[PDB]
Structures are given as structure tokens and as C-alpha cells.
Amino acid sequence: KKKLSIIVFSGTIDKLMPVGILTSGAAASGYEVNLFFTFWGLQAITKRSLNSQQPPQIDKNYEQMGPIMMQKMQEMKYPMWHQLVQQAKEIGEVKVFACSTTMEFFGIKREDLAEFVDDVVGVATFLDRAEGGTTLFI
Amino acid sequence: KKKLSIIVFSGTIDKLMPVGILTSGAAASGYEVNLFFTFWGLQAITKRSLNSQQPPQIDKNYEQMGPIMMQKMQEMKYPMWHQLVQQAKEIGEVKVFACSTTMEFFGIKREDLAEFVDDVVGVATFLDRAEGGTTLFI
Amino acid sequence: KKKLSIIVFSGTIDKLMPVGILTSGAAASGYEVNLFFTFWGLQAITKRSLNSQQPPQIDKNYEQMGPIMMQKMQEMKYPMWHQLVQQAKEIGEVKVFACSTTMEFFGIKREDLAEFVDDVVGVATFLDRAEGGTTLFI
Numbered sequence: 001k002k003k004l005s006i007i008v009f010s011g012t013i014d015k016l017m018p019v020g021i022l023t024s025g026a027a028a029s030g031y032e033v034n035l036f037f038t039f040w041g042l043q044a045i046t047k048r049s050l051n052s053q054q055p056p057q058i059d060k061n062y063e064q065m066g067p068i069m070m071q072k073m074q075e076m077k078y079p080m081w082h083q084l085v086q087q088a089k090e091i092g093e094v095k096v097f098a099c100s101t102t103m104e105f106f107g108i109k110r111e112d113l114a115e116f117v118d119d120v121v122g123v124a125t126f127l128d129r130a131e132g133g134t135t136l137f138i
Numbered sequence: 139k140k141k142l143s144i145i146v147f148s149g150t151i152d153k154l155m156p157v158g159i160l161t162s163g164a165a166a167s168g169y170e171v172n173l174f175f176t177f178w179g180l181q182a183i184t185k186r187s188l189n190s191q192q193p194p195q196i197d198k199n200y201e202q203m204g205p206i207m208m209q210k211m212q213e214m215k216y217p218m219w220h221q222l223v224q225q226a227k228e229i230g231e232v233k234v235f236a237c238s239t240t241m242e243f244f245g246i247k248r249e250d251l252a253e254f255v256d257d258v259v260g261v262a263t264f265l266d267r268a269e270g271g272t273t274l275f276i
Numbered sequence: 277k278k279k280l281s282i283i284v285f286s287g288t289i290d291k292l293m294p295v296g297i298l299t300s301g302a303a304a305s306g307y308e309v310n311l312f313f314t315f316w317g318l319q320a321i322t323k324r325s326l327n328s329q330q331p332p333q334i335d336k337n338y339e340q341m342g343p344i345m346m347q348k349m350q351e352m353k354y355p356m357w358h359q360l361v362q363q364a365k366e367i368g369e370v371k372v373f374a375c376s377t378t379m380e381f382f383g384i385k386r387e388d389l390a391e392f393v394d395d396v397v398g399v400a401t402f403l404d405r406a407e408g409g410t411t412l413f414i
């Protein structure tokens with residue numbers, strides 16, 4: 001069985017969209033997908049971040065291009081990255097993991113995380129799950 | 139035959155150079171190389187971007203170090219990233235793909251893309267092509 | 277024979293920490309680990325950069341969150357990324373490589389590199405070592 005594992009390190013919207021798109025497409029294709037949220041990505045899956053009214057953060061390197069993208073996505077009614085992940089779970093085999101080390105660094109507790117997080121694990125556990133499939137660091 | 143596949147997400151010069159160097163080095167070593175330009179990387183392979191007279195953009199995180207690099211490369215007459223890719227295509231087995239989803243988000247049409255793009259494809263296509271080789275997200 | 281290879285392109289502290297954490301965890305789990313420092317990551321392993329008194333650089337995209345992280349790490353007495361890598365070498369099979377191309381671009385000589393660098397090699401040499409294992413670009 002085909003497998004895709006992604007270490008979701010980044011927390012800007014322009015990087016979270018690819019995560020959602022890859023996850024959704026891979027799940028639809030019948031892949032096993034493993035997501036490992038760490039550092040800024042882990043911050044992005046906290047309930048506080050997900051419910052924030054503040055406008056999503058685009059990478060400062062491409063600020064000038066931000067509105068074009070945001071405007072064209074809302075125009076297409078394109079789902080948000082987290083909705084893509086949750087829908088993928090319903091359609092295929094998708095597991096969402098939170099990095100335990102980052103949680104200590106940012107003082108994040110399990111209860112602070114989105115309901116769709118399946119487990120809190122360390123690095124080695126993710127390496128073992130990623131073994132043999134395609135693996136990306138985003 | 140060894141294979142390298144790269145998702146070229148970034149569009150800053152400091153990230154596009156590695157793409158060129160990896161492609162060139164791998165192709166010369168006998169690797170099959172697949173490049174998938176998406177988001178900012180897709181912007182970078184539009185004819186408009188390639189022909190722009192505006193100075194390449196370094197990652198804002200390393201601005202202070204930008205000139206040192208730019209100066210030392212023009213001093214060595216080091217080829218531009220896209221020249222390295224095109225030369226790699228002539229030397230080895232290199233395929234350049236453009237992401238169809240990003241093209242919709244940024245209103246880019248096939249005619250707007252550089253001639254060296256072989257095809258416009260979606261995510262699953264690139265997963266399929268990458269399967270079994272080394273795969274990187276840049 | 278489980279193996280992890282990482283192309284360490286980035287030079288900000290928030291990206292170097294994951295490199296140390298991945299290396300340390302992988303080595304402790306019995307993985308062979310290969311690190312290839314290139315571009316800004318290569319700069320980060322020069323003796324000058326390692327001995328610098330200047331405060332580590334966080335990604336400008338997450339400046340606001342920098343102090344929280346630094347403060348919580350020094351509070352836990354969390355080792356620095358390079359200490360995690362050197363400790364991993366002592367514990368397991370970890371090899372550190374420097375990118376020969378970027379060394380020309382930045383005018384870095386072998387003597388300028390940290391003693392823990394095992395060899396200076398080109399990109400195809402490192403791809404050959406990475407083949408068959410999990411490979412990441414950070």
C-alpha cells in the first residue's frame with residue numbers, strides 16, 4: 001500500500017494549503033497518509049489558532065502575492081486546509097500526529113489541540129511510520 | 139535507474155539555485171529527475187518572471203547575505219538556475235511539470251509557461267512519478 | 277538498515293533545532309543518519325558562526341513567537357542543535373557532510389568548518405548515500 005508522510009513544520013497559509021491538497025489527493029488515491037505537526041505547524045492545529053479571527057499569515061517573502069491567492073480561493077469556495085485534512089480522514093486512511101517535543105517548548109497540552117489529532121508522539125515513532133513511503137518536510 | 143523528484147514550492151533565488159544544482163548534478167550522475175513547480179515555484183517558471191529585469195528575490199531571512207552570494211556567482215559566471223535545468227534536460231532524463239491547481243489560483247495559463255515545461259498535471263500524478271525514488275519539498 | 281538523510285539548507289534556529297532533534301532521535305533509534313549542509317546550513321556549521329556571540333536568528337515569519345521558544349528551551353536546559361548532532365555521532369552512526377558547491381559560492385575553506393564535519397562532497401555523492409532511506413530537505 002502506497003504511503004505519504006509529511007512533517008508539517010511550517011505555519012503560514014501558503015504552506016498549510018499544500019499540506020491539505022497533498023493529503024486530500026493522496027487519500028482520494030488510496031494512500032495511507034501520516035501527518036506530523038511540529039513547531040509552527042503544531043501551533044496551527046491548536047484550537048486557539050484554528051478559531052482565531054485574525055487573517056491567515058502568508059510567508060513574508062511573498063506578501064505582495066497574498067491577496068491574489070486569498071481572493072481567488074474564496075472566489076472558488078476552496079476549502080480551508082484543515083477542512084481538507086478532516087475530509088481526507090473521512091474518505092481515506094489519514095492519521096494526524098502532534099510532536100511531543102514542540103508541545104513542551106510552546107507549553108501546549110493535549111486539551112489545547114484540535115479534536116482531529118489522533119496521537120501525540122516523538123520523532124522516532126514518526127520515522128518508523130514513514131518508513132518505506134514518500135516523505136516530505138514542509 | 140535512480141530517481142529524484144522535487145516539489146519546487148519556493149520562488150526565491152536562494153531556493154531556486156539548489157533546485158538547479160540538484161537537477162544538474164543528479165542528471166549528470168544518471169538519475170531520472172522530475173520537477174513539479176507549484177505555488178511560488180510555478181510563478182518562477184512563467185515567461186513573465188523569467189524575462190523580468192527586476193533583481194532576483196533572496197529570502198528575507200538572509201537579506202544581509204544576499205549580495206555576497208550574488209556577487210560570487212556572477213564572478214564565477216555560475217549559470218542561472220533555469221539554465222542548469224535546461225542543460226540537464228539536454229544531458230539526461232529530466233521532466234518539468236507545472237501544477238494545475240496553482241495555475242487556477244494565480245490565473246496562469248499554459249501559454250504563460252516557459253517552453254521547457256513538459257506537462258501540466260495534478261498532485262496524484264506527481265506522487266505516482268515520485269514513488270520509489272528520493273523526493274524533496276523545496 | 278533504517279536510514280535518514282537530511283539536506284540542511286536553512287540556517288535559522290527554528291529550522292536547525294528540528295535537524296538536531298531528528299538526528300538525535302533517529303540515532304537513538306538505531307538509524308544511520310546522513311546530514312548534508314548546504315547554502316545557509318553550511319554557513320551555520322562554520323567555526324565563525326558556531327562561536328558567534330550574536331543571538332540566533334529566528335525565521336522572520338515567526339519573530340513574534342521567537343522569545344517564547346528561546347526562553348522555554350533555556351528554561352528546560354535543552355541542548356543546542358549542534359550539541360544534539362555531536363552527541364548523536366557518539367551514540368550512533370551519524371555522518372556530517374559539507375556541500376562543496378556552496379563552499380565555492382561563499383568562499384569557505386575546509387579549515388573554516390566545524391571539526392565534526394566528516395567530509396566535503398558534491399550533491400550526487402550525497403544522493404547516492406540517501407538512496408533507499410527517508411530523505412528530507414530542511
Ligand SMILES: [Cl-]
Nearest residue numbers: 136137275413
Ligand atoms: Cl522534503
